[model samples]
Target chain A: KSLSMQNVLIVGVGFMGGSFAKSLRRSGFKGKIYGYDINPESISKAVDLGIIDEGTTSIAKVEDFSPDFVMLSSPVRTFREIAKKLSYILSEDATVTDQGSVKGKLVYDLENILGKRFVGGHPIAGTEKSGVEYSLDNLYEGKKVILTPTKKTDKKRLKLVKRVWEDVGGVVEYMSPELHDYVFGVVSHLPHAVAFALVDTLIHMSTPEVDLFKYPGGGFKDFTRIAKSDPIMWRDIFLENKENVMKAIEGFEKSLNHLKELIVREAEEELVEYLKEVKIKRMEI
Target chain B: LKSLSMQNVLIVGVGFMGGSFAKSLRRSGFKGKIYGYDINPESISKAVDLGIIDEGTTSIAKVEDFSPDFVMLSSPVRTFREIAKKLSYILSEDATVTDQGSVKGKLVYDLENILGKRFVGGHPIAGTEKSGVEYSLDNLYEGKKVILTPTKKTDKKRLKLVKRVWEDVGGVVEYMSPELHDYVFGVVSHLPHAVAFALVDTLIHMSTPEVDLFKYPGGGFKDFTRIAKSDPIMWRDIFLENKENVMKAIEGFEKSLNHLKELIVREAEEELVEYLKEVKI
Candidate 1:
């Protein structure tokens, strides 16, 4: 139960992982933290900036630190492979978790690899910016962090991992992996997918010439800012959580049709009311 | 043709709209004296403190003493009507006049009845949540619509003067009848605001309260809910003035809503996808 003496190893200390390490340290976690990233520059920068005590490109060195807790917070492809690799080297009772956006696919792969030791986690908090420089200790403060611990998860390891997250300023909640995917699909993943498609569509329709002069206002600019985020990360999220994301897309489409019909019919009041309903719903939520 | 030398322009109610108008004017090459006022003590105090205007005052009589070549009524609806009436009797004949608010019906009615000959009407199409004298700028109307409505008895010279005023301030001027102005704005402006407010209020009221629907709103909810921050009194006036157009807009939007509801209930993916593809962007 004394987590302060635990040695924590965080793989891929970019945005999420780096921020987690900072939060842990700031929130009085006395554990020695080590991190790793495939990119040598990121590893060096993280170590130089004191974001992590040590960082390297090798998963083999992770065990030398005698880590009691291991965190996989990398991009999807890297996270999956790292989780698989770390499964073989983790100490018999070490607690393991992740900060990936999607849980359905990763949870299954991780379940098979690490069996009872691993817990799937997703702190529903982030910005479009990437890297350790953008990391903040308070990112998860007052935010929800969903834990999807399968039936096979060792109850002891689940408790420790939950405690570790809570110590780092996270409000942890339990959710079945299936439910986590479906709910987030509507709220987060689906919205990102639509934003991407919208940016693409606007570019195509507006054409470079017209778009150049249209003077996109603050509304459009902020709406599409996330579109400029890492395409690879978003692409994997869409593919990994395809089914739930598709359902959300369907929900949004229905909303869009209603908006379009109003525009076409010139139903001024009705359109206003409909948008008002959406506004009101959004306000309450 | 040189705007800065043509006249001294006084902008009342130096809030977001008025401040922005000041910025637009300077950017558009207006070098003349620009004066401002606001009844709010804090706004009048800050306008002078912030140096956004050459001078500031709470009294309308004091501002009329400057004998400005243009008087812009930029106050909230109630004050705008009263100020327009006051300026009608005191301001010089050569003075061009306008206002900046969401709805123009009541403004035009009150002002036209008194300041009819000296004033051609204007409603510059730009604004934000920010208000008060400190927020005013000269270039706020750049690239935005500056609607001009002149009645049958209105002087052509005065209409042209109003157009010149807005044009000099970098606004694109367009002529429309007051009725059409109400119609166009009811759809584009008033309805959008009402819709935004309703949308935010709906989710707040109808959602499964136990579920954390609001936790992950991101930017969409923020953008859609932005107009909710607008002045309540101003919105009330807009809704009252254009109630007919707003009702029509509501009718049109409902038809769309029912169609979408049907698609969702039936799980008709093909038709939903088709409509989604066409309207999404």
Candidate 2:
């Protein structure tokens, strides 16, 4: 199905937004792509690289362009203010969707403000690198885009958002806003938190003699790559999805503690059995 | 410079590590006959079938008859001690021995006591999730780091031969005490595997068919879970053998995880960002 989306306005044209615009254009969405970013450099770079047709630093510029679809591709913390602003400027028929990592709060707040026009979206794709410089035309190709729709969400607006992601080569899946937060809190957000903390701990625990980071084998490097993700974005995610992320962390701590107890007590048979079960589970993935 | 001219190399426990080392030596232009012995007759037969070893046997007594100039013990750490005790009476006075076990302190301590100057503890820091003779690679040790733990009782000539053996198989060798080796690997290798397994365990407990946690694993999750596919028996042995060091590393990881949890709990955005920046390196 083709995206009926006419003019698209992308707020915060960094890696996610910039890549979305490029992917849309590559998928033959022949519409004007206008981008706005807090950083003027990102806006200019998105425009210069042809990822967007026009760009500006001012959110007010979006009013003049009159986009049919407003993609809120900013940090989760900025979503509240952006939703409020877009509610005032965009046409009543204009559909609003966000590309935030956390969904429960943003979806609730945006739906409360924008009514039938808001749908929550999260594309499960990205590299460790950030900014528009790393954006690719096929960034969303064959990737999953989860649309978290509440009971009050307008069916037409949800369909339109789904179509847009589909047009950009995303396989669309539906979930409730709460389930979205919980699932991602467990898989994505909690892992990032664990990784950041792991690296931080290693750094603090390092001494002249140990030099822990220097001797990291392939496994450590691979396991901690997410620790180097964009801090501002991840920090916003942890804060916005606080309760769920915290719950996930508590769950992780229990698991970690169980294994820790096994090691402390030197429970060889039990530890081997537990690790073997986990290995079987991981291989299923 | 071709000190790898030492003839008749014997490999004990022809599993992945042992089989791979034999293949790597052959590829490195070592013309010596590589003899192998394992507790499992199938492993020996497979290694011989794949041309990884010139001859194979399931008897430890054959290791004595081979009279190899060098012997590599690629079994579990506990088995290393047991094999060292057995080989002590059989090995020639000039023969040198090394091991590919992850934990070193206990193995080294025991071997040094049993075989004295002939035992040099070495850990080739390389492996994939898969194991066994079928998965052996000729270049498994290429560009990898092999740590050799030498004590005051270590023979210098035997140490030089052991170092040259690793170098011939394209490994860059570093020396540390057995204590130091166990300490570093406990943090870097063992801790990461334990964390991955724990993370998987938590998700498995939390997930249901409708909300299967493994359904939407991104690149980050895949990378983090890679070590969880490791051999369970092997990892369990490593953790047990290096109990003290592994416990210390786990405690360190808990402290780090708790600190991050607190930051999230307090909603300390700036502090969280600062912490992330520190961790980015």
Candidate 3:
């Protein structure tokens, strides 16, 4: 299980992929960084940005690059189909990993497809911005990188993948695939869901007389900044992690209901305590 | 018709908003004696020591001794009417008055009735989670939106004076009806604070014996709820004073939540994408 630092391939060369490629290079990986994207524009754009050394549009072309380490950077829904193709194209010793937000069953399915070569990971850092043009080379610096490895996952490949993340300045931690989904479903996915819903709330609430968008102040702009993220990416996530996402949404609804109850009753002291508790907790973070 | 340069200004409440107003007026080069009136003795002394105000008193009645021609109500929304009544009795009829209070619905008309045509309702869309005169910022109002709600009964001269003062303080002034101001902010501002508080509360309860959700906090939830750490009394007053609009905003938000939940449960891939995209676009 000797590890090779050469010939890395990035699938779906967007912001996340571009960030990984740049960070890997910046961390002194001497690999020939290649990119394969369904969009030809991304291929050219990624190459021009120097995020990738060379690029491709066809899945078939990935074979020629002979990527020792394959980073599955596509939307979660597209991972399985692409991983299936990569299974045949890549060498038996090639290691694969992801930058997807969800792990859960997706981790198991990818493990089933790509065998021990697949290692599922998610970085706990990113912005509301989308596209390769918005990528930041230092995206992973000082950020938490969650690696969800099951019993079937190869220790050597997982160890190699973990080191790769560490070299790019990620503080790594291990978790079961199921645990990663539940924890992030509440802490991460739920917030994004609420942010999107909040923006939508303003859209429908705005009257013709007063476009609410004009008055994007009082924390509205900063509050809904994450709503500007890629819609397709979020949509796929909601579907892929439906169970946990829905559970988180329900739990959040209960919390909202509790606040509304206090407001409706005009329970002044109770309301104050509610706000105070929340304030103290938020300040702790 | 008097120049702000000749007028002695009084800041009531003297917290962060009140203190900032005194400092901003001074920074804008108003060659007037700045005075402060606050219930907290600490605030009065701190503001004066920080040179936020030239002089300050704990008594509202003593404000007449300073003969303030301009009064800025910088207290909680609930305290405005009580302070306005005292100002109405203590100050001259022609003395101009304005406020940095968050709510202006029924309170606006009530203050107008108490202080007469001199009372001009205003709200500065500025400030941080910080409270107290000690944390008061000097240039807080600069390049920030200051909404002035002038009604039919509002004196034209007084409104103009207030607008000019705000402009000098580097505020971008906008006009809106008092009712509409509440509705706009209820959704745009107050509602968000309420939601942020609730998000933190969600973490408090949803966290279990095995895992505390707060343990994982670098992402959206942490930044999103930082506003929740704002002063509780300030937010409590906001939620209650703007109760009607706050409730409306929350209800509307609940509808949005419901729709999103349904789309998630049904796994309506295209519709879900469409809904999320509406927010993105």
Candidate 4:
């Protein structure tokens, strides 16, 4: 079968990028997969593992390939800078998307810089483990991908990007960049922040005799597993989406304070009612 | 051939904890007649149907006639307290009693005062979001930790029996004072549930459609929300019973949350990253 895209370029061939390459290949994309990363070891490993047909350490080498599709899989903070740098190297019609968690700022700025060629995409699938070795060909299978298209987005290019995700068995949903940021800022970003804070609290309160985490049951592990995420990536997300994240944190604080007040007031019935609502709502998910 | 020592076992409040314990006991090769009691006759009938108990009744007075070698009071803290107070007259002199309640300080104190050597406070630290006899698992306590808080007055023989019972069910037993059990669990177990409930409550109260807030739940959100699906009445009693330590834990959590919030407000990327690094450890 003829491939939809002739060639694909993946930046930062780590877990997300490497998985994209493998999934694209599995989807029968008869194209060369080229990867670039700052870490020479990662690029070499990606080549050795057959995750990429070719690998490069230099950004300029990406232009030599003249790939029709590009995936920016770098940290959230690097999206714009990389897009700006790639603008000079990439062909005018090259369709570029990212796997960054936060989309508002990245999409807004990339759209401004790259015009219709850049579409924001976040695949809602990953494990706590990172790196190319963890990449699986079916990682994106049956997963959801949110594509944020701005007014400046090219409908044809957006359609092509959506098809790329769909070809790899990803269910695609479209959202405004603003709503994408707001929704994920609350669900994904804010939850990470809270988990990090929860663990940080335990660390602060931990003492030699009273190691707060010593006796934690399964619940603690479940709640704080995300706290073990890539620190630099999450730090970038928290800062990049600071406004929305702060708002979410404030909302969470208000709700937590309400529970505290109920507890302090010894309002048994009200506390039970509030918690019952939470339990029911969570089960609905 | 599997029976080590056959004993009559009576489980009070045949819900999740009690029903689970009964099933675990049978799986552990206990060659005994297991009796169950619950306020809800439906729960009693369900436990009996599931073969978790050989017989079950809704009457507490049946305990006197059952003449159980062990009485496992696996109920809410309030119910356990009332049963502990009443078991003195119902249980025979040699009958040993234990409980699977989360809070142990008050229960241990009350039971030791009333029944002295026969009482041991036990808490099996295992559960899922689902409850009731239908959700009971025979292997629920396998490879799980069961904390047995034995007071100074606890009977050595009775404590040994309780330890063997948990061990038979594949639980690794740890001993702690009733006070320490309360404080530690308050911080670890109770505090996390409260936080989860509060987080879910926040999402529910968000001005956005609840579907909008829930539609994007990633692994982190799902993990954090798991405990939020727990029984509200059970957790309500935990928070209220372990009030002081839970309050202290919430205070510490608030301070930490504020610290992170300030870092975000100030856009202290370096500090926030450092904080994240600290937590990752």
Identify the leading candidate in terms of DockQ: 3
Q: Stretches of candidate 1 above 4 Å error?
A: A1-5, A207-209, A212-214, B1-126, B129-212, B218-281
Candidates 1 and 2, the one with greater TM-score:
2
Candidate 4 C-alpha lDDT tens digits along A67-186: 889998878787777888888988888888888888887788898887778989999995777899888898888889999987788998899889989988999999888888777777
Report, to 2 decimal places, the DockQ of model 2.
0.72
- At residue B183, candidate 3 shows an lDDT of 96
Each prediction's whole-model lDDT (CA):
0.67, 0.85, 0.87, 0.83
- Could you give candidate 1's per-residue lDDT for residues A172-243 as a string of tens digits? 988888877776776666545544443443333343433411333322343345555665566556567777
Writing each residue's lDDT as its tens digit, candidate 2 over A109-207 gives 888988899999999985777889988888888889999988899999888889888878899999988999899999888788777777766786678
- The residue-level lDDT of candidate 3 at B124 comes to 94
Candidate 3 error regions (>4 Å): A1-3, B4-6
Docking class of 2: medium
Runs in model 2 lying further than 4 Å from the true structure: A1-3, B1-5
Q: Tell me how far the alpha carbon of residue A266 in candidate 2 is from the true structure, in angstroms, after superposition.
A: 2.1
Instruction: Provide the clash count, candidate 3.
Output: 0
Candidate 3: deviation at residue A222, Å? 0.7
Kept native contacts, as fractions per model, are 0.08, 0.70, 0.76, 0.71
Task: Provide chain B TM-scores across all predictions.
Answer: 0.87, 0.95, 0.96, 0.94
Report RMSD (Å) for each prediction in the order shown. Answer: 8.1, 1.7, 1.9, 2.0
- Candidates 2 and 4, the one with greater DockQ: 2
Quote the positional error of residue B201 for candidate 1 in Å.
10
